[PDB]
Amino acid sequence: DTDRARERDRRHLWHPWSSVRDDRPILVAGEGCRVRDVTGAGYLDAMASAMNSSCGYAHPALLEAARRQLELLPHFDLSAASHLPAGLAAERIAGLLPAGLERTFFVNSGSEATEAAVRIAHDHWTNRGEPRDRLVTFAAGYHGTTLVAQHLSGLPTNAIHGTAPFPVTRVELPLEPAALRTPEALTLLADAFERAVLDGPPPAAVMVEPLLNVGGGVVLPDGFLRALRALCDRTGALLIVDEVFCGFGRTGRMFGFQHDGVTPDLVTMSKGISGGYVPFAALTTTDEVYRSFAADPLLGGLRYGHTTGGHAVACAVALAVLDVIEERGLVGSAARLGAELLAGLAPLAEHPEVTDVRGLGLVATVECRQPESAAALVAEAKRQGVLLRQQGRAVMAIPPLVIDAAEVAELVRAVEQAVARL
Amino acid sequence: TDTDRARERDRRHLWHPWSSVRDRPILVAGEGCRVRDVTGAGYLDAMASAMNSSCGYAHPALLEAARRQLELLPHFDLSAASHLPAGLAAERIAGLLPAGLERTFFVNSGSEATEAAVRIAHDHWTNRGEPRDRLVTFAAGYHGTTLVAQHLSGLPTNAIHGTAPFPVTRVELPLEPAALRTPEALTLLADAFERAVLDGPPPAAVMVEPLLNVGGGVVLPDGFLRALRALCDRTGALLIVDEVFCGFGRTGRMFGFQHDGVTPDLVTMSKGISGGYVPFAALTTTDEVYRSFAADPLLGGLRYGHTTGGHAVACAVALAVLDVIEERGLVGSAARLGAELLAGLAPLAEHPEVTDVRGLGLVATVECRQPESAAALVAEAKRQGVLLRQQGRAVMAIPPLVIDAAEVAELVRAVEQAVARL
Ligand SMILES: Cc1ncc(COP(=O)(O)O)c(CN)c1O
Ligand SMILES: Cc1ncc(COP(=O)(O)O)c(CN)c1O
Ligand SMILES: [K+]
Ligand SMILES: [K+]
Ligand SMILES: [K+]
């Protein structure tokens, strides 16, 4: 059986983001923040399954919501019909966002949310009789895996397989991530984005994460998004914030953008929204953007949509996730336990192979000098009983939001033990 | 007042897919082939929820499979780990496909499957040291809603929001769909695709559906895919068959391409694979294509992947779907009952307003002379208690594969009554 399982994987399964050339762990069961492999070895899962297990494994509220809705109605095509969970989820998600962010479109993944967002930005300007094709982004940003999503990024492995479908101006970090959390760095960042925005005709949108995930758990200086909000007002560009990773408590606020206290024009969301239990993603925008689509000549609406976008089970699970977050105070717990986590790890920056320790809420990153060190850190933490996420030179701790104080201490100890062996 | 509140929150907060900005039934529960709205009215659901409920609503085997896996492990990141459902599903899907199709990549939607398939096609040629950028498609084809997927289509509402990321040669239908089922139509289609393939440097791939869904339930003549197989074999282009709609029994074979009896180089799948119960999609290709990715200079593998691609609950549900399809013989049932459905509808072509009646298995279409007639037909059928899908001029019946002879007769009677009132 173990022979056969390894063999069917080797022969038939194509893994994402992996080389064709140690065996991978086979995970089989989880409970709370712990997960177990096929040999019975147990681990604290400090990568939250796929950076999205906001409520941990086998959460009874999420399980029951899924079961109830699956039995009733898994979905129905929302193009010419509706269902009750889509209405509830659309209302509830709008309710968590600033005034004016009221209109929610559902898709399956963060990449599809990016696809819809970029279409909405371009088409909005067409609808207004003033076409704009250009977007401004971070070079170190990651917005998904489809051609349009990858085109927004300047990360080397995101090189696209065609030619550019529209112009993008990708802003490089003006300092190393370790030095980005100062007032001096805010000035450099704001001015770099001002130059990018004013380089040629006004852009359709500026699209950024509030904390860069795949780009290395990069924490931005206070005021950066506020500076972008001002730039967008001056130029007309839509401010799009990608909350796919930061959304729903990850950083110790309901959304990453709330640390700066800005109101975006469009927000994308996925990951923690459904606890990872059903594929689900969403975007929310303004009534002005929405209503502009009455000018679309071909349909009189947005020419976008997926078969399972707005899946009823996904919507029902998301509502249960939001109930758990609110009932248990997971946003506040993430802030408080997050502070403990970061404080526990911070002294490891004294180690010669550790360049920086940085984070916000329940994302924390140990940046090593080389990827080789990062891989060795991750391997030793695994030996200590803790699963972490490697991202090039960065090692990231991204636990379920239901993590407790004892488990945070265990996480810190494992990372200390790993750094000692570097 | 509950229903009023529901309609109001939808109107205020929900952005529907593929819809005009400027009312809709609210479906609340289903069982087998029947669904009920919020007012209590019941219908035979002859659009299978979202053209994807292969096993109908509240199927106990699928419900149990979802419950069991959700409780164990909803997913884990497949980039550097594995889980047992992904290995099982990869093997099982490959086993249903012809010899040589062995390597399966998982994504959430048909649109993502197209994104991955086009990247694979382009990157495969780069890996070989002979870059090829061009694809050949049907202008009336539909492959999804993201920019790349829309670019493959020539349908007017799929106009993209940027410029072409690669060249596409889109073949127009040489005859109306009603005249496309003959040996003369085969000659015209084969010759048109030959001209497209030989127009300029050899293409990377030829990508087609085996029966055009969104293009109007268009049935292609016997031998068309065999002609494309020879053209791909002549020029080296990859033969990509889009089975997102036709896959898993819909046309009375396990795959739509099996009517012609060809071996594609890559097949995309979604819809019926998970019964609609969890968002799920897949693609399967050859070892020749797979192993070429060792030459990728940035990763040594395919630079693609989604957070929830290979979702364990989705995989476990797909395994249960395949068990139901096989145990119940739904492929052959769809062939036989589908032939009875088409034979029941066929005399309606005598009506002045009906220009064709066409189908294969459990997709059947009544083509009207104008969209207004099609809309009227759908509306009267709904009054008779049957839900059908409008696709421009085309009215489509796409029931769950578990439909029985009595329900087929109900379906035929509703459509007869509808056509009588045109
Ligand atoms: C900020 C951000 N945006 C978009 C995505 C893409 O989401 P998916 O993998 O669900 O397509 C990710 C995935 N890591 C992300 O971190
Ligand atoms: C043949 C075909 N390919 C791809 C897609 C796109 O799939 P999705 O809606 O799941 O993105 C569809 C959707 N109708 C389809 O019919
Ligand atoms: K709001
Ligand atoms: K095979
Ligand atoms: K006629």
TrEMBL record, chain B:
<protein>
    <submittedName>
        <fullName>Uncharacterized protein</fullName>
    </submittedName>
</protein>
